[PDB]
């Protein structure tokens, strides 16, 4: 039919009109993660803004207190002592100056792509037309720019994520997995809600937080309470 | 031809491949009875078809006169002080004369030095279907099957 038998049974333990604070949501998402693998906890929401202008288009970063649990393979396009700086801190691919010569025919997606301030004249024409809207853009507001490139890679491998606003006007980003207890999920979902409060654009009027959903990869969502 | 139905002029089998069609194409390749340098050219073409494509030249030539024959066309014919461009399938004889003549004309609008390579490179393209000669076939049928409004005057 329209739905399933492993999906719909999850539509019995959650009332949409019953606002489950991140505690009755972090206790109920522990009974939504039924999968061969270990799911995640997709955290979504609809902000009170306008995604068509550039005064309220929220974006940035934020480290979650417990992390995620899903390892991300971060690489680099260094310049100087920032080639051995990302290789002492822990990086898969690093300072090869222009290793853009390998990735120009093929490639089966690793995870990340960082750089630095001086390789901006040609770090736009080589691999600036490929990963573009493929969310791997070395955007400095995204957190992938700077001479401190090996210092920004020990937190994206140990917790920190990225929440960007899309064309429509919402804010996504995972805050853990499905095997994370009621303490690791609920406390973490609190260090990402400040990231939407503190990064809250200026020209945005009204009650910024219209909604804040929290579900599980292949499971139903809960219109969780905003601050708690 | 106002009395008898004209009279189909009869060709003379091609001395190398047999077919009468062959010599006909040459008759067009020709200018001023220079039937030799005329004939000559046609073959030299095949020598390229042979080296450029391991396909028998004849087998190619035939298939190039085919993929070009225009199945229908437009011919003027007034009825009431108006020149409609009525379309009607074309005689299987004219259906050949056209294709042949065009393959020749086209083969002379290409930027190729020796005449040989022209008739050759062209033919090879008439078969594949992508040629300047194949072109008219298309632009002569796009004509009819467009003016198919005046069809009803099929004299």
């Amino acid at each position: 039919p329209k739905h399933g038998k492993r999906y719909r049974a999850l539509l019995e333990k959650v009332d949409p009109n019953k606002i489950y604070t991140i505690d009755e949501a972090a206790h109920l998402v522990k009974e939504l993660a039924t999968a061969k693998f270990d799911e995640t906890v997709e955290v979504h929401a609809k902000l009170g803004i306008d995604p068509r202008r550039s005064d309220q288009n929220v974006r940035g970063t934020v480290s979650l207190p417990h992390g995620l649990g899903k390892q991300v393979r971060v690489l680099a396009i260094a310049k100087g002592e920032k080639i051995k700086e990302a290789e002492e801190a822990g990086a898969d691919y690093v300072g090869g100056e222009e290793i853009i010569q390998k990735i120009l025919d093929g490639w089966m997606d690793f995870d990340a792509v960082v750089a630095t301030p001086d390789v901006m004249g040609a770090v736009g024409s080589k691999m600036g037309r490929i990963l573009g809207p493929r969310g791997l853009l070395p955007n400095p507001k995204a957190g992938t720019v700077g001479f401190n490139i090996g210092e920004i890679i020990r937190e994206i491998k140990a917790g920190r994520i990225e929440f960007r606003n899309d064309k429509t006007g919402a804010i996504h980003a995972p805050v853990g997995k499905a095997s994370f207890p009621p303490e690791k999920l609920a406390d973490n979902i609190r260090a990402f809600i400040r990231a939407l409060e503190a990064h809250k654009p200026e020209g945005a009027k009204g009650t910024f937080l219209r909604s804040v959903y929290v579900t599980t990869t292949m499971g139903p969502s809960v219109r969780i309470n905003p601050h708690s | 031809a106002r009395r008898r139905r004209a009279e189909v002029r009869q060709l003379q089998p091609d001395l190398v491949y047999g077919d009468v069609l062959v010599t006909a194409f040459i008759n067009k390749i020709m200018r001023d009875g220079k039937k030799n340098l005329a004939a000559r050219i046609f073959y030299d073409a095949c020598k390229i078809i042979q080296e450029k494509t391991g396909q028998e030249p004849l087998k190619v030539f035939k298939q190039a006169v085919e993929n070009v024959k225009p199945r229908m066309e437009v011919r003027s014919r007034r009825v009431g002080g108006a020149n409609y461009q009525v379309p009607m399938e074309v005689s299987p004889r004219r259906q050949q004369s056209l294709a042949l003549r065009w393959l020749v004309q086209a083969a002379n609008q290409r930027p190729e030095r020796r005449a040989a390579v022209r008739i050759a490179h062209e033919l090879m393209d008439a078969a594949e279907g992508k040629g300047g000669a194949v072109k008219k076939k298309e632009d002569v049928e796009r004509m009819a099957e467009a003016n198919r409004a005046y069809a009803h005057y099929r004299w």
Partner: protein
């Protein structure tokens, strides 16, 4: 919206364009078509080929409307007319029957001087 398989198809064939309407059993337009609806304009509308297309187009635009069988009624003259009937048939419809209902005055209004050559 509503969908009914039984129908009635009208052929108003004139001189400058053949036109056809397809109604329901009560005679209410479900959809219509004409030499103008198709790409044609001007004189080549009155031509039969146009009539055919019009009929076909009318059929399909009537078919996907829940049609299956129609009652044909022609009116007028002009080339197109004929082709139009034959077109409705070999087109996928069901010509249940054809009638020739051309309007004729039992001598009423005087016609224009064009139509009055019949002095």
């Amino acid at each position: 919206k509503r969908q009914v398989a039984s129908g009635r198809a009208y052929i108003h064939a004139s001189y400058n364009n053949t036109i056809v309407t397809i109604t329901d059993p009560d005679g209410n337009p479900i959809t219509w078509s004409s030499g103008g609806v198709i790409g044609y304009k001007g004189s080549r509308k009155g031509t039969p080929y146009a009539a055919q297309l019009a009929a076909l187009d009318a059929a399909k635009k009537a078919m996907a409307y829940g049609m299956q069988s129609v009652d044909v009624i022609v009116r007028g003259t002009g080339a197109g007319r004929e082709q139009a009937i034959r077109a409705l048939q070999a087109s996928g419809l069901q010509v249940k029957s054809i009638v020739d209902d051309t309007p004729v005055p039992h001598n009423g209004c005087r016609p224009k001087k064009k139509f009055r050559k019949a002095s």
